[PDB]
Design an enzyme around this catalytic site. Structure first.
Site, PDB file in Angstrom:
ATOM      1  N   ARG A 192       0.850  -1.186   0.000  1.00 48.07           N
ATOM      2  CA  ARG A 192       0.000   0.000   0.000  1.00 48.07           C
ATOM      3  C   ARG A 192       0.882   1.231   0.000  1.00 48.07           C
ATOM      4  O   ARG A 192       1.853   1.289   0.763  1.00 48.07           O
ATOM      5  CB  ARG A 192      -0.918   0.077   1.241  1.00 48.07           C
ATOM      6  N   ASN A 203     -14.107  -4.963  -8.852  1.00 46.98           N
ATOM      7  CA  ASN A 203     -12.655  -5.066  -8.731  1.00 46.98           C
ATOM      8  C   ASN A 203     -12.216  -6.512  -8.504  1.00 46.98           C
ATOM      9  O   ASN A 203     -11.460  -7.085  -9.302  1.00 46.98           O
ATOM     10  CB  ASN A 203     -12.237  -4.149  -7.569  1.00 46.98           C
ATOM     11  N   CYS A 239       2.130  -1.672  -9.914  1.00 44.95           N
ATOM     12  CA  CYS A 239       1.944  -0.841 -11.095  1.00 44.95           C
ATOM     13  C   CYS A 239       1.057   0.359 -10.785  1.00 44.95           C
ATOM     14  O   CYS A 239       0.020   0.230 -10.128  1.00 44.95           O
ATOM     15  CB  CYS A 239       1.326  -1.658 -12.222  1.00 44.95           C
ATOM     16  N   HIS A 268      -6.840  -2.816 -10.512  1.00 40.69           N
ATOM     17  CA  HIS A 268      -5.727  -3.137 -11.439  1.00 40.69           C
ATOM     18  C   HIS A 268      -6.164  -4.090 -12.563  1.00 40.69           C
ATOM     19  O   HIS A 268      -6.319  -5.273 -12.291  1.00 40.69           O
ATOM     20  CB  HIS A 268      -4.525  -3.723 -10.685  1.00 40.69           C
TER      21      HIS A 268
HETATM   22 NA    NA Z   1      -8.035  -5.866  -8.442  1.00 37.29          NA
HETATM   23 ZN   LIG Z   2       0.249  -2.545 -14.924  1.00 35.43          ZN
END
Ligand code: NA
Ligand SMILES: [Zn+2]
Ligand code: NA
Ligand SMILES: [Zn+2]
Ligand SMILES: [Zn+2]
Ligand SMILES: [Zn+2]
EC number: 3.1.-.-
Lengths: 162, 162
Positions: free
Chosen positions: A60, A118, A104, A97
């Site tokens: 985090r 998510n 990333c 993500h």
């Molecule tokens: Na995710």
């Molecule tokens: Zn990425």
DNA sequence: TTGACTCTCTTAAGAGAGTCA
DNA sequence: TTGACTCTCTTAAGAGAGTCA
């Protein structure tokens, strides 16, 4: 409170810093047996991370800027979405993500959606395997597949029907 | 308890009690525009729940038996799987509701798998929509669909590529 | 104003254990 | 022995906020 012009400047400074993060080329499953390539902009493993960035947990981070003597701080992946609604259908919006790579910070690999949406991308067959997400997945989810179930449905007697 | 005979006896008494729970018919999406019917054996909403059963959380229960003059206690959905390995690939095995109905204790609606496999069934297209689970789903997951993404991937400048 | 640490919290799929009567 | 309550914990996708120099 911050003006929308001040928010845009935060987003711009965030983009300029993340753009200098190491860019790593990853080959990834797309579904349907096809392979593709994603380019992740990865925050470093240890300090220093980049101007404005600090680690608040093992995976985090937060982004911090001081504007007119007031310290403002955001989750490190939330900054691309500061001019968007922060909730939908009564659910908090979260940074998701599409590359499934927590380090990333490439905003072209992020979307902004409920925690349920998510999470669900982890099991998506992918953009070439049948993804139905309206904002399409970039790759097959890492947990997609037959699974590893130890024991299936079963009974010893005859008390039950399906 | 310790012996296989004792464990079989626990499973048999658990089945006899759950077999007396109210049987509720639920019509469910299967994927592919098809519908099916499941018969869930539902634990009551309030005490008494059945011999051996007690509520430890809003939708958590435990099954308790006295063997060797000692109290042995298990999560209420884990009892069918007491003779199975309790882990797989180093991950804890968990009771997974194929009917996505927490009060149901029908062992024909349960399997035993990692928490990741368990969760992932929430987004499965279902047995007539492309489920690839080796232990097949009984229905389309309740969270399957396009999602409600508020904002997709985007950048303000020219620092990033996909 | 900034960096590098510290702490706890949320969610929804799941758990273990203690206090009484 | 059995019943009916109480409490906190686990996981892996995510968060908010304090201290010090
Ligand atoms: Na995710
Ligand atoms: Zn990425
Ligand atoms: Na489940
Ligand atoms: Zn998808
Ligand atoms: Zn059921
Ligand atoms: Zn399935």
């Amino acid at each position: 409170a911050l003006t929308n012009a001040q928010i845009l400047a935060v987003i711009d400074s965030w983009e300029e810093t993340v753009g200098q993060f190491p860019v790593i080329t990853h080959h990834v499953p797309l579904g349907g047996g096809l392979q593709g390539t994603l380019h992740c902009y990865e925050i470093p493993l240890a300090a220093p991370y980049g101007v404005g960035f600090a680690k608040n947990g093992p995976t985090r981070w937060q982004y911090k800027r001081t504007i007119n003597q007031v310290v403002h701080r955001w989750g490190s992946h939330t900054v691309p979405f500061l001019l968007e609604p922060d909730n939908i259908n009564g659910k908090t919006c979260t940074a998701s993500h599409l590359c499934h790579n927590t380090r990333c910070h490439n905003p072209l690999h992020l979307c902004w959606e409920s925690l349920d949406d998510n999470k669900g991308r982890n099991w998506c067959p992918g953009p070439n395997g049948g993804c139905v997400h309206a904002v399409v997945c970039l790759r097959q989810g890492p947990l997609y597949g037959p699974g590893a179930t130890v024991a299936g449905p079963q009974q010893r007697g005859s008390h039950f029907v399906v």
